[PDB]
Write a protein that binds this ligand. Sequence first.
Ligand SMILES: *[C@@H]1O[C@H](CO)[C@@H](O[C@@H]2O[C@H](CO)[C@@H](O)[C@H](O)[C@H]2NC(C)=O)[C@H](O)[C@H]1NC(C)=O
Ligand SMILES: *[C@@H]1O[C@H](CO)[C@@H](O[C@@H]2O[C@H](CO)[C@@H](O)[C@H](O)[C@H]2NC(C)=O)[C@H](O)[C@H]1NC(C)=O
Ligand SMILES: *[C@@H]1O[C@H](CO)[C@@H](O[C@@H]2O[C@H](CO)[C@@H](O)[C@H](O)[C@H]2NC(C)=O)[C@H](O)[C@H]1NC(C)=O
Ligand SMILES: *[C@@H]1O[C@H](CO)[C@@H](O)[C@H](O)[C@H]1NC(C)=O
Ligand SMILES: *[C@@H]1O[C@H](CO)[C@@H](O)[C@H](O)[C@H]1NC(C)=O
Ligand SMILES: *[C@@H]1O[C@H](CO)[C@@H](O)[C@H](O)[C@H]1NC(C)=O
Ligand SMILES: *[C@@H]1O[C@H](CO)[C@@H](O)[C@H](O)[C@H]1NC(C)=O
Ligand SMILES: *[C@@H]1O[C@H](CO)[C@@H](O)[C@H](O)[C@H]1NC(C)=O
Ligand SMILES: *[C@@H]1O[C@H](CO)[C@@H](O)[C@H](O)[C@H]1NC(C)=O
Ligand SMILES: *[C@@H]1O[C@H](CO)[C@@H](O)[C@H](O)[C@H]1NC(C)=O
Lengths: 295, 248, 49, 128, 67
Amino acid sequence: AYTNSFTRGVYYPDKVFRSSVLHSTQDLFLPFFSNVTWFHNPVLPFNDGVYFASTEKSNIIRGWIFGTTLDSKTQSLLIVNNATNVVIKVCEFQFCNDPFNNCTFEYVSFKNLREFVFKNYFKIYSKHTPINDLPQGFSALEPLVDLPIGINITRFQTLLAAYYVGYLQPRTFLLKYNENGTITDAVDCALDPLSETKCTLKSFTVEKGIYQTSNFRVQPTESIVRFPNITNLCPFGEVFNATRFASVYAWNRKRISNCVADYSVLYNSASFSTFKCYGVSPTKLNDLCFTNVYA
Amino acid sequence: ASVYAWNRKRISNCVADYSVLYNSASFSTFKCYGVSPTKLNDLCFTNVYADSFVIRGDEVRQIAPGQTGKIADYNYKLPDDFTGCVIAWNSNNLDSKVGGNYNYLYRLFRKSNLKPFERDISTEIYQAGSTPCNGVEGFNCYFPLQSYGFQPTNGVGYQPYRVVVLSFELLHAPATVCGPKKSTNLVKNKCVNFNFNGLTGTGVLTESNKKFLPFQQFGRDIADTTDAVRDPQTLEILDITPCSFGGV
Amino acid sequence: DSFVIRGDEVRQIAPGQTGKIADYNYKLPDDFTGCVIAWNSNNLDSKVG
Amino acid sequence: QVQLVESGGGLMQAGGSLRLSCAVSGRTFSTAAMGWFRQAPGKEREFVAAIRWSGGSAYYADSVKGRFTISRDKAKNTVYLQMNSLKYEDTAVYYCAQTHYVSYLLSDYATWPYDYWGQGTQVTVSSK
Amino acid sequence: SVITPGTNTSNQVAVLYQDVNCTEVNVFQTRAGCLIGAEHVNNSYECDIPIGAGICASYQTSQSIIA
Ligand SMILES: *[C@@H]1O[C@H](CO)[C@@H](O[C@@H]2O[C@H](CO)[C@@H](O)[C@H](O)[C@H]2NC(C)=O)[C@H](O)[C@H]1NC(C)=O
Ligand SMILES: *[C@@H]1O[C@H](CO)[C@@H](O[C@@H]2O[C@H](CO)[C@@H](O)[C@H](O)[C@H]2NC(C)=O)[C@H](O)[C@H]1NC(C)=O
Ligand SMILES: *[C@@H]1O[C@H](CO)[C@@H](O[C@@H]2O[C@H](CO)[C@@H](O)[C@H](O)[C@H]2NC(C)=O)[C@H](O)[C@H]1NC(C)=O
Ligand SMILES: *[C@@H]1O[C@H](CO)[C@@H](O)[C@H](O)[C@H]1NC(C)=O
Ligand SMILES: *[C@@H]1O[C@H](CO)[C@@H](O)[C@H](O)[C@H]1NC(C)=O
Ligand SMILES: *[C@@H]1O[C@H](CO)[C@@H](O)[C@H](O)[C@H]1NC(C)=O
Ligand SMILES: *[C@@H]1O[C@H](CO)[C@@H](O)[C@H](O)[C@H]1NC(C)=O
Ligand SMILES: *[C@@H]1O[C@H](CO)[C@@H](O)[C@H](O)[C@H]1NC(C)=O
Ligand SMILES: *[C@@H]1O[C@H](CO)[C@@H](O)[C@H](O)[C@H]1NC(C)=O
Ligand SMILES: *[C@@H]1O[C@H](CO)[C@@H](O)[C@H](O)[C@H]1NC(C)=O
């Protein structure tokens, strides 16, 4: 199931007060008019950030789990609100298949619409509203919690009524703060060309005209590298395939100059027991020139 | 900890007396970027990260912004815009023993350079050539880590050095790590030189009527300049009006 | 200006340096215009014991 | 420091197979590699086989490659030398060794001077 | 460039990619570039929103933008 994320998923990106102003900010927001997955239990990814919403009549949903595996063997975050308090912990928990130690943090605190944003350490914004699937309109989410936990999260699940999930993206927004410092309207600077225009002019009201907004530029599809035919190989054969070698006290010195040195033939060969290189990698040698090489 | 598995300690919600560090005679390297040590006493931060590890002497230079080499590439990378301190001192007395201490490791191979403050602790067999290793060492299949040879008789360049890197979190949030600098009483309706949590300025502080949210720390003007603050000691909001001036 | 220091502190004798020497012993200005000459004196200023 | 204790030596007929054990105790977390060496009467000590503790990759001397297998049980802190297709030339005292030195290059364990040594166990191979 | 009547009028707009082809990206190629979201009309009018090289655009009747 899918619904429209009309204008929801706007939160105060910073702790700064601003009044009667339009401020442009880049951060992870919920793209306007996007698809939100609709559920009425399973494990869901946590791409860069999550917009969760719940329509509740009896407060069925209680908590969230976050992490990588969401079983023991690693740390995982658990958040639970039970009627009077909230509990947050980051232990390497043994969870059940269908749930409903080493604790490095612990904290203790349809008509209901509860909207939350979880992002990365950990930031949780939320907003509670009365409502009459996903309501059309506009409201901002104030931050609630900042957990300095530094837990790697790539997946999450819910602990229990409908809910919806959206995924945040790095989108530039223009936000309209009123006299009271409340966000009352926003523009997604990349939703549609009119929005690009609005963002360019830093206004919500574009007068009739033609406005230069962006710059179209074709991106290159591939890389071409051309150099002349490889020629005048260095006489490595002369040295390695030499019939007779010199005594250690009278070690031979061959000077190599004015040639192309194919080191691949050497470091990829299986004929050498020792191929030790100090302060240089053999592979890298192919990208390097030298005045002289001494064998 | 080994450089490849450098420890990270978080420092928060405390008073940092940095004198204890820069007035100590125990440190060979005390190098601060984007900050002066002395000034630290006057500054607050949301978080401090103490990244601790051990390297050899000659590699201490690699612990600095935009450096290259085995350490800076595969073990521990500082950002080009790093704002913090690097402290290093010889640990030959502790980390070296007769016969060689090999408990300290470094990553010698990696498929790419590390990102700033990236930590790679993987032990996957490095595929140097075209043949997949399938977790089997051999020709062009090497273990990514290697030991340090720390003997008491080693050259100062090869002697062990203990390194602590302090990163400071200058963000727009409440700052919980402050210097020992004492606070004073607040004065209203006068031109004053104010310092809130290291945020310095000159102005007239007045009772504001701005509806700051319970979380909102300070406010800004159109010019991205501070227009109103929340007192760290009192949950009171003050408007800052710049000290009366005019052309003559 | 003549004096004696240890080797590793020679670096402190330069404009805008910090440390015991640069702070408490001998401070050069940031706009110093002159020469700093230093040479090892182990043969002269060191003795057994 | 670690203590190495070998067992499993004895008399076997040529063509047979025998497993030696070396149990490691003490500072077991330090183990980077284990090696087996042998000393025949009147001959110098000779490298046999080495195993990296992490990953379990093995390196063998040419004289035993394809006949001997080295394995290790991390949980039990024990290394094994499985000596298959026993020959007269295998008669020797076998020693296990441990090092905390980590080389990027497995082959270095053939020549590395190790940290700790077992007591040795005699293997004698009987004719035909 | 984005061609728009006032938001006060409509939220429907057109786009001009300047001095490019219509290949590279209700589409119309003009001396000015690739024009998208505007209907080409034979009838000629007074210039409302200048586009260039003699092409203007406006918002007209059911209603849409026309060049
Ligand atoms: C956070 O945890 C996830 C999940 O364990 C890690 O994702 C793995 O990344 C590697 C390298 O890209 C992949 O080969 C794996 O397939 C991923 N795991 C899964 C389960 O898909 C991720 O590396 C961790 N990130 C950090 C920075 O610790
Ligand atoms: C909600 O669950 C929590 C955890 O099970 C309970 O909180 C505990 O309350 C007792 C009594 O005050 C404390 O000693 C514990 O420290 C609390 N634990 C945690 C983790 O917070 C709480 O009682 C439950 N509330 C309900 C069911 O209303
Ligand atoms: C900003 O806050 C002020 C103060 O609360 C708002 O003015 C009030 O509006 C409510 C709702 O209509 C009334 O019940 C009060 O009587 C008003 N108070 C005063 C002193 O006028 C103001 O409307 C808010 N801003 C916006 C955009 O609504
Ligand atoms: C949402 O998904 C449906 C079906 O996949 C798709 O047709 C629709 O365009 C999507 N919504 C958008 C892009 O607004
Ligand atoms: C907990 O910590 C101990 C000590 O470091 C460790 O042995 C164990 O693996 C850890 N367990 C989990 C599940 O994180
Ligand atoms: C020496 O010659 C043989 C084939 O005759 C070849 O395999 C080997 O690569 C040569 N040596 C070098 C350095 O190429
Ligand atoms: C310390 O700060 C708190 C802030 O809530 C305040 O209540 C208290 O009076 C302060 N104490 C002193 C002695 O300044
Ligand atoms: C829009 O235009 C009409 C005239 O067509 C005018 O009465 C009205 O004030 C304008 N409204 C806004 C909100 O700009
Ligand atoms: C647009 O593309 C077509 C096909 O490549 C080409 O024939 C035409 O000349 C192009 N337009 C101009 C005016 O160059
Ligand atoms: C406008 O004129 C062009 C060129 O003669 C023709 O192809 C087109 O059909 C005409 N359009 C209308 C609406 O008559």
